[PDB]
Design a protein around this ligand. Structure first.
Ligand code: SF4
Ligand code: SF4
Ligand code: FCO
Ligand SMILES: [Cl-]
Ligand SMILES: [Fe+2]
Ligand code: NI
Ligand SMILES: [S]
Lengths: 283, 484
């Protein structure tokens, strides 16, 4: 990219998120986040980092959305709570009208080129939708479908995702669009999504079948304490067998560690996270 | 002449974490009333019920992806107490290295990536424009450029801090490496070299760029030390245990209010809900008996943040609170720049005086000084850690138990309380940092700390009311933590 290059507009809306999906993106090594923001995308609305505020920030997004109707990328971080007429997540106020996350997705969702559901909350419901919750936390694709909104959705899950999965999916899409135009490009992206809407370059391989401790698993040599790094982590709760992600190879935070080396995999990219991956510390 | 009232609503407040609306009443050029609303709820305290208690130290981190190590720490301390787990000495130190690295990340993120645009004009492209036409950006071309250059460099430095967290924490956000019983990975000689090499780069940035720029920018905004006092009342619950007794910590506990130091007794914490969207019958509970029953339609309420009070007092938390309560020596460069740029002679933090410390800019100064202070703590832990020595015990889950973990998240005091029955979570209650800062009125109508700190903030241009959110940002809010 260049400072003077083509950079498509992106709005980043936070529903029931923890901001971890923004923080993980800030950890991108290559391209760095500075290069992403200044050379790859035009991040026009993002409440954690943008200069302006309040109704002025909302109106800025609305002006850009009108100029780029059908052409902006909408990133959703967090689930969308439908109970209590949307009151469990208000994202802004303009013209003396509160804007719930429900309202915002009904407003911007239909006019996006594509919706990138970043993180397991947005993709699948995640912790806010887990047992004991009461807000009607809903995944992006289900919310849009329930409301007749046909805009393409790409899921980039994880709790949080690796920065490379987020940036890499953007790059995948921008490449396909450069080659084929917007509609043809998004069709090429959809062709490389698995049945859970995840891009197969990042989510097409199973952790366990590629794990360096697989020999120990097959031998039945299981660590009985977390700090035993020789044995397999299965008895300590590792969910690698049921998890589709490339963490075994790219690892985390500049390659310095990953969950299975350090402790256990908790299956954070999977549609049933957390309840179907719990208890975390037994098989 | 003079001006009457204007009421200004800001939703979303940006360059904070999470979902906040602020509404202020301005009369005659100053804020005379304020209401803060946490506008998003998830309900971790009910989601946690019925689970294996060990799951909590993963689930709770998802309260907040900026400060997950704080929740990890409070949770594993609570579980340690409930389980009777005796963390090995080397595991205590490893935990301190994991968590301390995120203090560095968080304060650097806060000053540069959240706060600095309050004082610095960024590049002429999104997300740095558009902004208020009269943003009150006072820095010279050269100093503004230093701010931008340091913002950009700080993106790399904060990333390196997360590498430090992940070396023994597994990944970040959301560490895998803290569990009941200690830390899951023994530090090796080789990985301690890698932690130290990264730490040196962070140290150099903190000493040479960050601490100096805060005082230097502050010296162009001296008016910002004269506002934002609020109650001038602070809380610290202790953090970073320095031995295995549970009685000695890097930050020692204490309360400060009405000009007086007092001990911290956690039984004096009560959470009120009159102005919060929770069932009225749950008001006034200490956390050991806490209840979380949402009531989003309750008349008169305006926030999903409960209203914690300490013996009836509305208190603030965070770097200012800790540095005021503990009164450490100031950094060498802070002492020098206070003299050179402000004419202030100071040796210890309280030598700033109550008024200047408890101010909009004082809270940024406190956070920079605390970052410098943490360098020395981390250096000490790097000398104290023993490569290869075990860091965890493996305790059985109890059928019936309770425990409380107390720590200081980067934004202020944090506690988690767990009660276990039938080997599952029966209750889990969280009283977090931005809860203490960004809460609404209590049942008596007494404002929360930030609400009160907004009183007197100048708004000489209602069309560019920049100081309202500048004050809020000085407290480094994260509303995910506040509401959970
Ligand atoms: S159970 Fe976990 S540690 Fe064991 S081989 Fe599979 S992925 Fe690796
Ligand atoms: S190893 Fe498992 S828990 Fe860790 S990031 Fe990958 S999928 Fe998530
Ligand atoms: N730091 C942090 Fe998070 C908040 N507020 C906690 O506790
Ligand atoms: Cl933290
Ligand atoms: Fe709580
Ligand atoms: Ni937080
Ligand atoms: S936070």
């Amino acid at each position: 990219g260049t400072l003077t290059g083509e950079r498509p507009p992106v709005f980043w809306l936070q529903g029931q998120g923890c901001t971890g999906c923004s923080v993980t993106l800030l950890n991108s090594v290559h391209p760095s986040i500075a290069d992403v923001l200044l050379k790859v995308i035009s991040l026009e609305f993002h409440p954690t980092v943008m200069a302006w505020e309040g109704e002025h920030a909302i109106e800025h997004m609305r002006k850009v959305a009108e100029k780029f109707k059908g052409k902006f990328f909408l990133v959703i971080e967090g689930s969308v709570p439908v109970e209590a007429d949307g009151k469990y997540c208000i994202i802004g106020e303009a013209n003396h009208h509160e804007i719930s996350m429900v309202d915002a997705l009904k407003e911007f969702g239909p006019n996006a080129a594509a919706v990138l559901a970043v993180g397991t909350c947005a993709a699948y419901g995640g912790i806010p939708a887990a047992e004991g919750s009461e807000t009607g936390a809903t995944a992006v694709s289900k919310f849009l479908g329930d409301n007749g909104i046909k805009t393409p959705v790409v899921n980039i899950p994880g709790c949080p995702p690796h920065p490379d999965w987020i940036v890499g999916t953007v790059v995948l899409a921008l490449d396909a669009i450069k080659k084929n135009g917007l509609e043809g490009g998004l069709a090429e992206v959809v062709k490389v999504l698995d049945s859970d809407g995840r891009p197969t370059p990042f989510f097409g391989r199973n952790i366990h079948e590629n794990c360096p401790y697989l020999d120990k698993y097959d031998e039945g040599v299981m660590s009985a304490t977390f700090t035993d790094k020789v044995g397999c982590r299965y008895d300590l709760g590792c969910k690698g067998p049921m998890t589709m992600a490339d963490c075994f190879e790219r690892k985390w935070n500049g390659g310095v560690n990953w969950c299975v080396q350090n402790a256990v995999c908790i299956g954070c990219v999977e549609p049933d996270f957390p309840d179907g991956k719990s208890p975390f510390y037994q098989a | 002449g003079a001006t009457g009232r204007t009421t200004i609503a800001i939703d979303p407040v940006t360059r904070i974490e999470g979902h906040l609306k602020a509404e202020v009443v301005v009369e005659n050029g100053k804020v005379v009333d304020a209401r803060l609303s946490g506008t998003m709820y998830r309900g971790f305290e009910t989601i946690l019920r019925g689970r294996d208690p060990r799951d909590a130290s993963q689930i709770v981190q998802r309260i907040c992806g900026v400060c997950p190590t704080a929740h990890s720490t409070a949770s594993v301390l609570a579980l340690d107490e409930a389980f009777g787990a005796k963390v090995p000495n080397n595991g205590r130190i490893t935990r301190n290295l994991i968590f301390g690295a995120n203090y560095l990340q968080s304060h650097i993120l806060h000053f540069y990536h959240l706060s600095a645009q309050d004082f610095v004009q960024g590049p002429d492209t999104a997300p740095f424009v558009p902004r208020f036409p009269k943003s009150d950006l006072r820095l010279s071309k050269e100093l503004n450029k230093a701010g931008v250059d340091q913002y950009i460099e700080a993106l790399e430095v904060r990333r390196i801090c997360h590498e430090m967290v992940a070396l023994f924490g597994g990944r970040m956000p959301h560490v895998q490496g803290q569990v009941v019983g200690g830390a899951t990975e023994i530090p090796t000689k080789e990985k301690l070299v890698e932690y130290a090499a990264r730490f040196k780069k962070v140290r150099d940035f903190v000493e040479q760029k960050y601490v100096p720029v805060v005082y230097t920018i502050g010296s162009k905004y001296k008016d910002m030390f004269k506002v934002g006092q609020g109650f001038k009342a602070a809380l610290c619950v202790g953090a970073f245990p320095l031995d295995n007794s549970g009685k000695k910590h890097l930050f020692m506990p204490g309360v400060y209010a009405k000009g007086k130091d007092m001990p911290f007794d956690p039984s004096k914490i009560k959470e009120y809900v009159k102005y919060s969207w929770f069932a009225e019958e749950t008001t006034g509970l200490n956390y050991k008996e806490g209840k979380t029953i949402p009531a989003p339609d309750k008349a008169g309420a305006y926030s999903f943040v409960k209203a914690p009070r300490y013996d009836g007092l509305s208190l603030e938390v965070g770097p200012l609170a800790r540095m005021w309560v503990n009164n450490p020596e100031l950094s060498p460069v802070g002492k020098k720049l206070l003299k050179d740029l402000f004419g202030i002679s100071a040796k210890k933090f309280r030598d700033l005086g109550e008024e200047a410390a408890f101010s909009l800019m004082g809270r940024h100064v406190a956070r920079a000084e605390e970052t410098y202070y943490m360098l020395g703590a981390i250096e000490g832990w790097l000398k104290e850690i023993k490569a290869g020595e075990d860091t965890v015990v493996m305790p059985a889950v109890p059928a019936s138990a309770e425990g409380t973990g107390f720590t200081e998240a980067p934004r202020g005091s944090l506690l988690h309380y767990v009660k276990v029955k039938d080997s599952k979570i029966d209750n889990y209650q969280i009283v977090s940092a931005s809860l203490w800062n960004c809460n609404p009125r209590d049942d008596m109508g007494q404002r929360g700390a930030v609400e009160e700190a907004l009183i007197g903030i100048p708004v000489d241009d209602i069309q560019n009311p920049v100081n309202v959110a500048r004050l809020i940002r000085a407290f480094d809010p994260x509303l995910g933590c506040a509401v959970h």
